[PDB]
Amino acid sequence: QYSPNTQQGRTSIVHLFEWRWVDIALECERYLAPKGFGGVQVSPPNENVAIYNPFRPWWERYQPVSYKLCTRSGNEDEFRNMVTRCNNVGVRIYVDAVINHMCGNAVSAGTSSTCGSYFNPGSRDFPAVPYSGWDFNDGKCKTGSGDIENYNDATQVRDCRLTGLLDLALEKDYVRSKIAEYMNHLIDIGVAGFRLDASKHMWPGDIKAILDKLHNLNSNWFPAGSKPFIYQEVIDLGGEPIKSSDYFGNGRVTEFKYGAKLGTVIRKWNGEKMSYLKNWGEGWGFVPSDRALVFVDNHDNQRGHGAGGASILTFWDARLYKMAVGFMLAHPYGFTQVMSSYRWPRQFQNGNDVNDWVGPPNNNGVIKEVTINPDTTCGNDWVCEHRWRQIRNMVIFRNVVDGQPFTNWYDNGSNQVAFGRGNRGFIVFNNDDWSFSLTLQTGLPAGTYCDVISGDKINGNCTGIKIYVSDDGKAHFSISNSAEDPFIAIHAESKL
Numbered sequence: 001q002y003s004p005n006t007q008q009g010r011t012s013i014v015h016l017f018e019w020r021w022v023d024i025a026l027e028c029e030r031y032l033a034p035k036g037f038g039g040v041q042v043s044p045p046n047e048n049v050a051i052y053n054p055f056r057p058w059w060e061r062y063q064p065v066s067y068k069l070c071t072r073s074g075n076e077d078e079f080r081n082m083v084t085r086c087n088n089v090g091v092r093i094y095v096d097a098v099i100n101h102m103c104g105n106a107v108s109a110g111t112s113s114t115c116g117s118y119f120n121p122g123s124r125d126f127p128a129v130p131y132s133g134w135d136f137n138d139g140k141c142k143t144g145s146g147d148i149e150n151y152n153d154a155t156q157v158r159d160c161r162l163t164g165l166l167d168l169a170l171e172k173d174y175v176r177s178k179i180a181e182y183m184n185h186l187i188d189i190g191v192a193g194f195r196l197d198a199s200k201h202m203w204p205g206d207i208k209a210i211l212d213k214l215h216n217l218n219s220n221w222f223p224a225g226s227k228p229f230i231y232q233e234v235i236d237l238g239g240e241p242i243k244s245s246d247y248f249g250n251g252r253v254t255e256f257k258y259g260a261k262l263g264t265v266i267r268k269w270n271g272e273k274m275s276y277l278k279n280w281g282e283g284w285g286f287v288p289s290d291r292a293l294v295f296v297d298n299h300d301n302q303r304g305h306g307a308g309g310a311s312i313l314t315f316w317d318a319r320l321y322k323m324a325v326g327f328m329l330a331h332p333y334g335f336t337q338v339m340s341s342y343r344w345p346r347q348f349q350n351g352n353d354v355n356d357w358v359g360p361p362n363n364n365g366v367i368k369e370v371t372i373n374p375d376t377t378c379g380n381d382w383v384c385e386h387r388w389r390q391i392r393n394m395v396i397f398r399n400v401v402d403g404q405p406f407t408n409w410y411d412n413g414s415n416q417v418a419f420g421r422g423n424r425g426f427i428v429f430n431n432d433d434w435s436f437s438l439t440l441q442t443g444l445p446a447g448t449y450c451d452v453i454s455g456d457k458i459n460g461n462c463t464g465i466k467i468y469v470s471d472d473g474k475a476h477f478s479i480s481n482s483a484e485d486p487f488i489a490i491h492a493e494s495k496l
């Protein structure tokens with residue numbers, strides 16, 4: 001469960017946020033597989049509530065109505081077709097599992113579902129599963145509002161409604177069975193793992209009970225005895241009753257301190273400088289590397305809905321974003337997840353986006369298909385950060401240096417640092433307010449290397465910058481503080 005279950009070599013997964021099943025299937029064959037991506041995290045594939053006020057927000061997908069594979073991304077057949085085509089190409093699929101709750105208790109009863117299933121939140125009656133009033137913690141919670149009021153109370157945080165979402169009683173074998181039945185369906189279809197949404201709101205023991213009823217990965221693509229990869233969404237920063245270590249027994253956990261910290265350092269906020277990254281990792285209070293799932297930003301905190309706050313770097317800050325992601329992909333700590341999102345009309349009104357709810361590109365509710373431009377970029381407002389040369393080439397970098405030790409670190413004491421990975425890769429950063437010109441020991445074999453940030457290597461020709469490594473692994477690097485991308489990266493596979 002700690003093993004991603006990706007093909008040998010592939011070291012990253014990408015979140016194709018709100019993408020359609022059919023677009024993902026194509027992307028797997030036309031780009032993800034060839035560019036070395038390890039897998040894809042998909043948006044919840046089960047039926048959810050169709051919220052029309054605001055108009056189809058992205059967060060409506062976190063309010064389940066049933067476990068039918070019927071959403072705006074596609075139906076069961078399209079979902080199945082996607083898993084098969086991606087697996088057949090070596091790209092794994094990880095599902096965002098919303099098993100801690102159902103829909104809002106204040107939501108109106110009826111058939112406003114992505115699949116037309118009937119539901120009645122008022123009477124806790126979800127016939128498509130089926131679930132009834134006896135399957136919720138309505139009588140287990142103590143709070144006056146029935147919702148979580150005090151996060152210093154681990155109990156109410158687990159038994160009370162998270163912002164009004166109907167809280168399922170995961171202690172009952174019936175509920176655990178219904179959920180496991182849904183998860184086994186996905187496993188048998190071919191998924192390699194799951195993201196356990198809102199894990200902090202579930203008892204570590206209830207989760208384990210559910211994982212105990214899960215089948216092994218499909219023997220057609222995975223070796224016998226393979227267990228699904230498990231990463232739990234636990235927002236744990238500092239001094240909270242619930243520690244992420246409490247979930248180490250079920251699988252990996254999302255390390256939200258990673259992106260929050262990296263964001264302030266790159267932004268150079270409150271005295272932080274890149275030279276401090278010398279001991280990045282557990283040395284900064286992070287969970288053990290072998291239990292961490294890291295990222296710069298996620299669908300939640302990229303729009304202010306998650307931990308990290310204002311220090312979080314997103315595609316909106318392209319220049320600084322690329323460096324942060326470049327640094328994360330080059331550093332050996334944890335398992336990396338790349339973000340892929342869409343553009344929305346950010347309407348900041350007194351320091352808060354009033355349009356952070358806006359859903360994916362759409363035509364009257366119907367999600368717009370992902371178009372590819374001649375320059376390999378996406379249209380229809382899909383950002384496709386994963387298609388950015390600087391990001392995609394760093395994804396490949398991590399694969400190439402997989403297993404190599406962190407070495408040859410250098411820093412000017414401010415914001416000019418560099419380090420290598422064994423003898424397979426080397427990266428240089430310039431985040432200071434002045435040019436960088438110095439000869440450094442890369443620890444790489446002599447030869448001409450293409451800088452994979454400014455360009456690419458194609459049939460023995462570099463389309464960008466070229467670095468020359470001496471017989472003693474030394475090479476000269478020049479980075480202006482005015483450069484489009486103030487960092488250079490070279491590896492064994494970019495050598496001419």
Ligand SMILES: *[C@H]1O[C@H](CO)[C@@H](O)[C@H](O)[C@H]1NC(C)=O
Pocket residue numbers: 459460461
């Ligand atoms: C790189 O490509 C060009 C043609 O586009 C060719 O003339 C040149 O010889 C190539 N160099 C190498 C080293 O293959």
Ligand SMILES: [Ca+2]
Pocket residue numbers: 100157158159160167168201202
């Ligand atoms: Ca709960």
